[PDB]
Amino acid sequence: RFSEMQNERREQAQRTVLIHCPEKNNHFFYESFGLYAVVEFIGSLQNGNKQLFELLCYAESIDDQLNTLLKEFQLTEENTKLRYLTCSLIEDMAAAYFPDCIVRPFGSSVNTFGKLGCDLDMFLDLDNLSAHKISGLMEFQVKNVPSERIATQKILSVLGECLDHFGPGCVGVQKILNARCPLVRFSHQASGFQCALTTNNRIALTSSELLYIYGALDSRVRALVFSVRCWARAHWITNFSLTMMVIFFLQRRSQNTETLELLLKEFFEYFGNXXXXXXXXXXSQSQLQKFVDLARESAWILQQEDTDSSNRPWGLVSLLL
Amino acid sequence: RFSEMQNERREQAQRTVLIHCPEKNKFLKYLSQFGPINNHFFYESFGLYAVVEFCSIGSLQNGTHTXXXXXXXNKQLFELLCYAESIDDQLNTLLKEFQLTEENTKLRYLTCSLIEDMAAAYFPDCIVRPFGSSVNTFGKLGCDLDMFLDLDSAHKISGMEFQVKNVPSERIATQKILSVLGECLDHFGPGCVGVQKILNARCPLVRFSHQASGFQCALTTNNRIALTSSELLYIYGALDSRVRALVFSVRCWARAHSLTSSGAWITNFSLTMMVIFFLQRRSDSLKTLADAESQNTETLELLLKEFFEYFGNFXXXXXXXXXXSQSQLQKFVDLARESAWILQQEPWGLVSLLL
């Protein structure tokens, strides 16, 4: 149901078209520098933040708080289908050199812990060149592949070069072919997405299927991470570290009627006692402390909360200050 | 009949495939299994290759994994002229031995197709056609294959007009285009080695080398002027046998002495001109030819001799030469005046002049 979901979404973009305009199936358009229109049916045409804080104090429980913070931050169908199209425009540019190739989004854009206004990560799947120029047992004629890493750095370098000079929207391009997982980041003007592309690593689509299955395995999972992160930001250790500990904290429990209010509070209580590879299995001292500090403090606030409410700091909002 | 010829030749390479092989009819018996097969031919750059042209071709691509006559593509020429039976049979041998051969001609039209393939990724309906010394009729074997990429698009539209990167000057557009193509040839483009960008010359170009064929290639983008220079001469070389025969030999003559070289001298194109010139100032102007589209029995022997005699005094121009080193031009006439004498008297004929 994940591999499946992506394909209905990808096929979706293929019939979608992004149109720029002045200022005047289902159709939906958005804003940025002008008014852009997303339209889906072909070659038939070509041929011719803080306000959130204050909005929580009007909810009628801590549990209704997490659920608002999640609603306001999580991606929206529009946006979701808009970064799938972006992937499609790219996949178009890369399908010139590499015919049947797929660029599909991954990470925070596809699991369920995607926040609005984040990075669109893209993974270019290739399953080199195929010309008239053959070689003989007939076999296509390619440029000898020393390591599959260089082949990455190359590929990315050319796509990179193409995006930059002739490829609409694509700006702020920059190559980073030397970082363990070589990548190329640019920016698409028509959408405001910080995007990044990589080539050889089916590991990210496998990291993003996990969380997918967790975020959709139970409502509260999405609710709890979205708030811990937000808590965490409000005050190193990576957004992925936390998330883990949270799916973790969720297993080391256990049907389970617990409330977000209770669950949240038990989050901090539980962690009262570098690497996302050292202190947590691959699925700064001063820092981790200040985390438990926060953890232990963010505990007591909710302790009073229950032990001992209006439109001045309460429940969650007390924890985002 | 030029624009025309180029298209049949291009369509021709489209159905042509270039195969690399070890070193051994079982072989056509093979390829035959993907459809007929017009002609075909061998040749060997730094290995042995097959150039096969089918009668489509997608099916062969669907067939992959993960005692033979080679069709040839200098000094011995000197000695071979001394066995011809007249000075006129000399110019016509020197011309046959040096001029391009169907094989080669169709081999550099295929190379253009493999390139055109790499640039039709970015620019769909683009054509890369060869030009210059590879297309007129004055092309000598083993010369430069010059190519011209003619350009006449995403979902991402703008309002209904496509969305492009703003074109500052059409010269930068060129420089950019050539840079990407250039980047692509170098890294992932089979055979294409020794690549090098030259984007600052007045005609920006990118030169490389194709291993599979030994061609020194060169690509440029915006200039229909070369396809217009090359049609002129075309019509000249084909307008009368002797033209081809005469230039091929004055060039050779030229090269033989420290004259026409591969800097600041006098270019193989200069000469050629003077010769088409020399040929009109006898008993067809590029005017009554450019805008529009007489017998003369002279022999090559006579013609050639009168070439040097005519440039014995050559305060006058010659429509430097109009576009249709002092010490050097002199040593030219020196040679001109001497290379006359020799034919005046009684190694022989031409070969006397190539020494």
mmCIF file of C-alpha atoms in Angstrom, chain B residues 13-257:
data_model
loop_
_atom_site.group_PDB
_atom_site.id
_atom_site.type_symbol
_atom_site.label_atom_id
_atom_site.label_comp_id
_atom_site.label_asym_id
_atom_site.label_seq_id
_atom_site.Cartn_x
_atom_site.Cartn_y
_atom_site.Cartn_z
ATOM 1 C CA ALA B 13 22.193 6.959 -41.049
ATOM 2 C CA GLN B 14 19.034 6.828 -38.994
ATOM 3 C CA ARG B 15 18.688 3.196 -40.083
ATOM 4 C CA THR B 16 22.377 2.651 -39.681
ATOM 5 C CA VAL B 17 23.980 1.074 -36.623
ATOM 6 C CA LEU B 18 27.672 0.992 -35.659
ATOM 7 C CA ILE B 19 28.904 -2.254 -34.102
ATOM 8 C CA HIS B 20 32.245 -2.997 -32.458
ATOM 9 C CA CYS B 21 33.621 -6.511 -32.870
ATOM 10 C CA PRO B 22 36.420 -8.956 -31.940
ATOM 11 C CA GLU B 23 38.048 -10.182 -35.122
ATOM 12 C CA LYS B 24 35.943 -12.692 -37.090
ATOM 13 C CA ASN B 25 28.686 -14.370 -42.713
ATOM 14 C CA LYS B 26 27.775 -15.996 -39.414
ATOM 15 C CA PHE B 27 27.894 -12.350 -38.442
ATOM 16 C CA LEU B 28 25.291 -11.099 -40.860
ATOM 17 C CA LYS B 29 23.414 -14.363 -40.300
ATOM 18 C CA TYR B 30 23.175 -12.995 -36.811
ATOM 19 C CA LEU B 31 22.179 -9.350 -37.396
ATOM 20 C CA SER B 32 19.980 -10.576 -40.216
ATOM 21 C CA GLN B 33 17.610 -11.827 -37.514
ATOM 22 C CA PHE B 34 16.535 -8.271 -36.787
ATOM 23 C CA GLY B 35 15.263 -7.522 -40.288
ATOM 24 C CA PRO B 36 16.855 -7.325 -43.785
ATOM 25 C CA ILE B 37 20.078 -5.242 -44.169
ATOM 26 C CA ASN B 38 20.972 -3.025 -47.143
ATOM 27 C CA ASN B 39 24.715 -2.576 -47.380
ATOM 28 C CA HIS B 40 27.315 -2.932 -44.686
ATOM 29 C CA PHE B 41 31.071 -2.550 -44.418
ATOM 30 C CA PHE B 42 34.129 -2.926 -42.212
ATOM 31 C CA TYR B 43 36.905 -0.580 -41.247
ATOM 32 C CA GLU B 44 39.168 -0.362 -38.261
ATOM 33 C CA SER B 45 40.168 2.662 -36.198
ATOM 34 C CA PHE B 46 42.136 1.237 -33.325
ATOM 35 C CA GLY B 47 40.078 -1.953 -33.506
ATOM 36 C CA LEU B 48 37.692 -3.568 -35.993
ATOM 37 C CA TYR B 49 34.224 -2.157 -36.543
ATOM 38 C CA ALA B 50 31.213 -2.952 -38.583
ATOM 39 C CA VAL B 51 29.006 -0.320 -40.179
ATOM 40 C CA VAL B 52 25.642 -1.868 -40.947
ATOM 41 C CA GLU B 53 22.623 -0.217 -42.492
ATOM 42 C CA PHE B 54 19.226 -1.870 -42.112
ATOM 43 C CA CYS B 55 16.349 -1.800 -44.565
ATOM 44 C CA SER B 56 13.151 -1.329 -37.827
ATOM 45 C CA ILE B 57 16.076 -1.099 -35.480
ATOM 46 C CA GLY B 58 14.491 -0.916 -32.090
ATOM 47 C CA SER B 59 14.381 -4.722 -32.083
ATOM 48 C CA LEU B 60 18.155 -5.036 -32.206
ATOM 49 C CA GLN B 61 18.486 -2.767 -29.161
ATOM 50 C CA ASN B 62 16.306 -5.486 -27.604
ATOM 51 C CA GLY B 63 19.110 -8.033 -27.792
ATOM 52 C CA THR B 64 21.811 -7.200 -25.253
ATOM 53 C CA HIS B 65 23.669 -8.198 -22.061
ATOM 54 C CA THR B 66 25.382 -6.041 -19.373
ATOM 55 C CA UNK B 67 39.408 -13.042 -43.983
ATOM 56 C CA UNK B 68 37.523 -9.703 -43.639
ATOM 57 C CA UNK B 69 37.934 -6.685 -45.951
ATOM 58 C CA UNK B 70 38.453 -3.340 -44.195
ATOM 59 C CA UNK B 71 37.299 -0.262 -46.158
ATOM 60 C CA UNK B 72 40.160 2.243 -45.760
ATOM 61 C CA UNK B 73 38.963 5.493 -44.144
ATOM 62 C CA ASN B 74 50.905 9.671 -49.063
ATOM 63 C CA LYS B 75 54.381 9.267 -50.542
ATOM 64 C CA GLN B 76 53.228 6.078 -52.222
ATOM 65 C CA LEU B 77 51.006 8.402 -54.172
ATOM 66 C CA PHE B 78 54.003 10.250 -55.627
ATOM 67 C CA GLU B 79 55.315 6.979 -57.049
ATOM 68 C CA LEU B 80 51.889 5.935 -58.354
ATOM 69 C CA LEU B 81 51.505 9.050 -60.520
ATOM 70 C CA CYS B 82 54.699 8.225 -62.401
ATOM 71 C CA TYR B 83 52.799 5.255 -63.937
ATOM 72 C CA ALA B 84 49.911 7.290 -65.340
ATOM 73 C CA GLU B 85 49.842 8.180 -69.030
ATOM 74 C CA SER B 86 49.461 11.963 -68.948
ATOM 75 C CA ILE B 87 49.514 14.952 -66.642
ATOM 76 C CA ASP B 88 45.724 14.892 -66.942
ATOM 77 C CA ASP B 89 45.643 11.298 -65.721
ATOM 78 C CA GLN B 90 47.735 12.468 -62.811
ATOM 79 C CA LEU B 91 45.378 15.045 -61.411
ATOM 80 C CA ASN B 92 42.596 12.463 -61.709
ATOM 81 C CA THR B 93 44.487 9.849 -59.763
ATOM 82 C CA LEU B 94 45.575 12.248 -57.049
ATOM 83 C CA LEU B 95 41.896 13.174 -56.805
ATOM 84 C CA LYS B 96 40.632 9.595 -56.589
ATOM 85 C CA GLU B 97 43.159 8.624 -53.955
ATOM 86 C CA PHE B 98 42.528 11.681 -51.756
ATOM 87 C CA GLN B 99 38.806 12.307 -52.113
ATOM 88 C CA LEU B 100 36.295 10.805 -49.659
ATOM 89 C CA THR B 101 34.769 7.441 -50.301
ATOM 90 C CA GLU B 102 31.095 6.548 -49.973
ATOM 91 C CA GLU B 103 32.089 4.358 -47.017
ATOM 92 C CA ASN B 104 33.809 7.191 -45.154
ATOM 93 C CA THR B 105 31.160 9.676 -46.328
ATOM 94 C CA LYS B 106 28.425 7.555 -44.855
ATOM 95 C CA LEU B 107 30.486 6.907 -41.772
ATOM 96 C CA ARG B 108 30.727 10.588 -40.878
ATOM 97 C CA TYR B 109 27.040 11.007 -41.552
ATOM 98 C CA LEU B 110 26.371 8.280 -38.967
ATOM 99 C CA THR B 111 28.637 9.876 -36.373
ATOM 100 C CA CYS B 112 26.563 13.023 -36.820
ATOM 101 C CA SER B 113 23.503 10.826 -36.125
ATOM 102 C CA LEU B 114 24.967 9.390 -32.912
ATOM 103 C CA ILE B 115 25.650 12.947 -31.788
ATOM 104 C CA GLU B 116 22.263 14.236 -32.996
ATOM 105 C CA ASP B 117 20.956 11.415 -30.795
ATOM 106 C CA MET B 118 22.675 12.840 -27.684
ATOM 107 C CA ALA B 119 21.372 16.336 -28.333
ATOM 108 C CA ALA B 120 17.843 15.176 -29.187
ATOM 109 C CA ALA B 121 17.541 14.310 -25.529
ATOM 110 C CA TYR B 122 17.540 18.012 -24.574
ATOM 111 C CA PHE B 123 16.251 19.371 -27.856
ATOM 112 C CA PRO B 124 13.690 17.000 -29.400
ATOM 113 C CA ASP B 125 13.460 17.724 -33.106
ATOM 114 C CA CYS B 126 17.030 18.883 -33.544
ATOM 115 C CA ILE B 127 19.299 18.137 -36.463
ATOM 116 C CA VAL B 128 23.077 17.786 -36.438
ATOM 117 C CA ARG B 129 24.343 17.883 -40.039
ATOM 118 C CA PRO B 130 27.966 17.811 -41.156
ATOM 119 C CA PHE B 131 29.431 20.668 -43.082
ATOM 120 C CA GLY B 132 32.553 22.078 -44.688
ATOM 121 C CA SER B 133 35.265 19.808 -46.055
ATOM 122 C CA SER B 134 33.097 16.776 -45.309
ATOM 123 C CA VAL B 135 30.189 17.766 -47.517
ATOM 124 C CA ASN B 136 31.180 19.979 -50.476
ATOM 125 C CA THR B 137 33.326 17.941 -52.793
ATOM 126 C CA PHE B 138 36.763 19.056 -51.796
ATOM 127 C CA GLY B 139 36.936 16.839 -48.793
ATOM 128 C CA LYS B 140 40.096 14.791 -48.476
ATOM 129 C CA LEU B 141 40.282 11.478 -46.637
ATOM 130 C CA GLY B 142 41.218 11.738 -43.009
ATOM 131 C CA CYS B 143 39.965 15.251 -42.422
ATOM 132 C CA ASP B 144 37.863 17.089 -39.826
ATOM 133 C CA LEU B 145 34.222 16.296 -39.496
ATOM 134 C CA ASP B 146 32.593 19.607 -38.702
ATOM 135 C CA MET B 147 29.026 19.474 -37.430
ATOM 136 C CA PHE B 148 26.306 22.094 -37.051
ATOM 137 C CA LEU B 149 23.469 21.626 -34.503
ATOM 138 C CA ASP B 150 20.285 23.213 -35.867
ATOM 139 C CA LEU B 151 17.483 24.085 -33.409
ATOM 140 C CA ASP B 152 14.298 24.998 -35.309
ATOM 141 C CA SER B 153 9.972 22.403 -23.529
ATOM 142 C CA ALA B 154 8.354 21.083 -20.304
ATOM 143 C CA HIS B 155 5.041 20.598 -18.530
ATOM 144 C CA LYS B 156 6.064 23.880 -16.872
ATOM 145 C CA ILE B 157 4.177 26.371 -18.995
ATOM 146 C CA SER B 158 3.647 30.159 -18.669
ATOM 147 C CA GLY B 159 0.724 32.487 -19.426
ATOM 148 C CA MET B 160 0.160 29.942 -23.470
ATOM 149 C CA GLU B 161 3.955 29.898 -23.914
ATOM 150 C CA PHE B 162 6.575 27.337 -22.778
ATOM 151 C CA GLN B 163 8.897 28.223 -19.908
ATOM 152 C CA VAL B 164 12.541 28.872 -20.764
ATOM 153 C CA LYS B 165 15.686 30.400 -19.317
ATOM 154 C CA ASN B 166 15.870 34.058 -20.409
ATOM 155 C CA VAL B 167 18.181 34.560 -23.400
ATOM 156 C CA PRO B 168 20.562 37.517 -22.741
ATOM 157 C CA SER B 169 22.469 37.355 -26.066
ATOM 158 C CA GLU B 170 22.193 34.592 -28.704
ATOM 159 C CA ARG B 171 25.946 34.185 -28.235
ATOM 160 C CA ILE B 172 25.659 33.093 -24.613
ATOM 161 C CA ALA B 173 22.763 30.812 -25.474
ATOM 162 C CA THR B 174 25.313 29.253 -27.820
ATOM 163 C CA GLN B 175 28.077 29.110 -25.221
ATOM 164 C CA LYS B 176 25.695 27.536 -22.709
ATOM 165 C CA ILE B 177 24.258 24.971 -25.084
ATOM 166 C CA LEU B 178 27.716 23.922 -26.191
ATOM 167 C CA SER B 179 28.827 23.688 -22.545
ATOM 168 C CA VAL B 180 26.136 21.192 -21.578
ATOM 169 C CA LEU B 181 26.385 19.090 -24.713
ATOM 170 C CA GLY B 182 30.098 19.314 -24.123
ATOM 171 C CA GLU B 183 29.685 18.193 -20.533
ATOM 172 C CA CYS B 184 27.485 15.291 -21.650
ATOM 173 C CA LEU B 185 29.799 14.023 -24.442
ATOM 174 C CA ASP B 186 32.792 13.924 -22.117
ATOM 175 C CA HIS B 187 31.279 12.019 -19.155
ATOM 176 C CA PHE B 188 28.597 9.719 -20.572
ATOM 177 C CA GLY B 189 28.834 9.466 -24.337
ATOM 178 C CA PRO B 190 30.523 6.400 -25.776
ATOM 179 C CA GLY B 191 33.744 6.899 -27.706
ATOM 180 C CA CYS B 192 33.740 10.678 -27.295
ATOM 181 C CA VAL B 193 37.155 11.523 -25.859
ATOM 182 C CA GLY B 194 39.697 14.310 -25.994
ATOM 183 C CA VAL B 195 36.847 16.747 -25.568
ATOM 184 C CA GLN B 196 37.584 20.467 -25.234
ATOM 185 C CA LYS B 197 35.471 23.614 -25.063
ATOM 186 C CA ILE B 198 36.287 26.707 -27.140
ATOM 187 C CA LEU B 199 33.449 29.076 -26.316
ATOM 188 C CA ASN B 200 35.291 32.334 -26.738
ATOM 189 C CA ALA B 201 36.279 32.293 -30.432
ATOM 190 C CA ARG B 202 33.890 34.248 -32.636
ATOM 191 C CA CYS B 203 32.321 30.941 -33.720
ATOM 192 C CA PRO B 204 32.058 29.115 -30.400
ATOM 193 C CA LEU B 205 32.771 25.430 -30.732
ATOM 194 C CA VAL B 206 33.500 22.207 -28.829
ATOM 195 C CA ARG B 207 35.915 19.726 -30.298
ATOM 196 C CA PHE B 208 36.318 16.101 -29.442
ATOM 197 C CA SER B 209 37.396 12.809 -30.957
ATOM 198 C CA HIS B 210 35.320 9.741 -31.758
ATOM 199 C CA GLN B 211 37.337 6.594 -31.015
ATOM 200 C CA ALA B 212 35.091 4.315 -33.048
ATOM 201 C CA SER B 213 35.961 6.221 -36.220
ATOM 202 C CA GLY B 214 39.095 8.311 -35.710
ATOM 203 C CA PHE B 215 37.317 11.484 -36.754
ATOM 204 C CA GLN B 216 38.505 14.737 -35.310
ATOM 205 C CA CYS B 217 35.071 16.296 -34.808
ATOM 206 C CA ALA B 218 33.895 19.817 -33.999
ATOM 207 C CA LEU B 219 30.404 21.019 -33.141
ATOM 208 C CA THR B 220 28.860 24.504 -33.392
ATOM 209 C CA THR B 221 25.298 25.731 -32.981
ATOM 210 C CA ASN B 222 24.134 29.012 -34.443
ATOM 211 C CA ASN B 223 25.384 29.650 -37.960
ATOM 212 C CA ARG B 224 23.507 28.615 -41.117
ATOM 213 C CA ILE B 225 26.368 30.373 -42.926
ATOM 214 C CA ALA B 226 28.498 27.213 -43.088
ATOM 215 C CA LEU B 227 25.699 25.235 -44.687
ATOM 216 C CA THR B 228 25.540 28.088 -47.135
ATOM 217 C CA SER B 229 29.300 28.198 -47.757
ATOM 218 C CA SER B 230 29.268 24.415 -48.258
ATOM 219 C CA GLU B 231 26.435 24.463 -50.820
ATOM 220 C CA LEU B 232 28.275 27.004 -52.904
ATOM 221 C CA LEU B 233 31.394 24.899 -53.342
ATOM 222 C CA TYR B 234 29.132 21.879 -53.630
ATOM 223 C CA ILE B 235 27.542 23.268 -56.735
ATOM 224 C CA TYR B 236 31.030 24.220 -57.919
ATOM 225 C CA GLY B 237 32.628 20.815 -57.401
ATOM 226 C CA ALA B 238 29.668 19.153 -59.068
ATOM 227 C CA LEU B 239 29.261 21.755 -61.733
ATOM 228 C CA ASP B 240 32.329 20.404 -63.503
ATOM 229 C CA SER B 241 34.773 17.582 -62.992
ATOM 230 C CA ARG B 242 37.923 19.677 -63.310
ATOM 231 C CA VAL B 243 37.116 22.000 -60.423
ATOM 232 C CA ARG B 244 37.469 19.158 -57.943
ATOM 233 C CA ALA B 245 40.501 17.911 -59.868
ATOM 234 C CA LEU B 246 42.210 21.300 -59.822
ATOM 235 C CA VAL B 247 41.757 22.249 -56.192
ATOM 236 C CA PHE B 248 42.752 18.840 -54.871
ATOM 237 C CA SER B 249 46.142 19.242 -56.600
ATOM 238 C CA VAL B 250 46.884 22.916 -55.866
ATOM 239 C CA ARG B 251 46.121 22.155 -52.230
ATOM 240 C CA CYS B 252 48.470 19.210 -52.293
ATOM 241 C CA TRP B 253 51.046 21.336 -54.123
ATOM 242 C CA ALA B 254 50.410 23.993 -51.543
ATOM 243 C CA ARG B 255 50.878 21.631 -48.563
ATOM 244 C CA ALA B 256 53.975 19.967 -50.084
ATOM 245 C CA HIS B 257 55.880 23.232 -49.606
#
